[PDB]
DNA sequence: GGCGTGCAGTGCCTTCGGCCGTGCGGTGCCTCCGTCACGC
């Protein structure tokens, strides 16, 4: 549908080799069709995109003030990757103290879509859990979204293990994100407040 | 000549030096299998 709620939407794109040329660009497609469902404002639904290796490469930020439609090109044009490390340790200790360093609006929610599809090296799991958690105290959902095989599960049910908003999407493939679109979105918007405050 | 240790972290508390602890790279399910450098 179309959502139009008081919502900090994060998008975290794997940037790994498991995804190839194509499959990331329906991963691509799947963000600008749900940025389509979203109303795009300041005021009600804003949007993050990043695609994360090694390291996290931020294409939009929260307080960008840019016209919904320039968003979508942005967020189409996200370049591929293809490392061979996709570090969601480090996307997650970006968008903890990158991101959400400040919490600016508290009278909206704060969702991290974790868009994963690899599974990172062991050594750099080690303070993992400690920014899911640490997300967790800033009132931050993670929602892990595994697609293929190679999707870490144990990480995926780790963050739901963290937090009880924290549910997880686990799919087959990339194709089957189109086809998983609808539903994802208004579980997303069912999390974040309808009304403004008084003012 | 075996051991036992190694150390991340916008770290933490009992503050300017202990205490916890994935030495580390890389495979592919995981918190790990198999491996190297030092000092003694």
């Keep these: 549908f179309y959502c139009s709620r008081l919502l900090d939407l994060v998008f975290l794109l794997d940037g790994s080799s498991r995804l190839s040329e194509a499959e990331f660009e329906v991963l691509k497609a799947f963000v ?31 307080k960008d003030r840019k016209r919904p439609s320039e968003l979508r090109r ?69 929602i892990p979204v ?3 095989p190679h999707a870490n599960l144990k990480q995926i049910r780790l963050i739901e293990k963290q937090a009880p908003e924290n549910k997880a999407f686990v799919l087959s493939s990339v194709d089957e994100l189109e086809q998983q679109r609808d539903e994802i979105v208004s579980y997303l918007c069912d999390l974040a407040p309808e009304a403004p405050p008084p003012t």
């Design 32 to 62: 600008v069709d749900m940025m389509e469902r979203l109303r795009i404002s300041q005021k009600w639904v804003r949007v993050a995109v990043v695609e994360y290796h090694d390291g996290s490469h931020a294409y939009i930020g929260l």
């Design 146 to 148: 595994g697609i293929g």
């Design 74 to 142: 942005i967020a189409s044009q996200v370049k591929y990757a293809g490392s061979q490390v996709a570090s969601t340790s480090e996307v997650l200790k970006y968008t903890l103290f990158q991101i959400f360093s400040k919490i600016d609006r508290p009278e909206a929610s704060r969702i991290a879509l974790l868009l994963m599809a690899s599974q990172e090296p062991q050594r750099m799991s080690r303070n993992f859990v400690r920014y899911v958690q640490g997300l967790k105290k800033k009132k931050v959902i993670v």
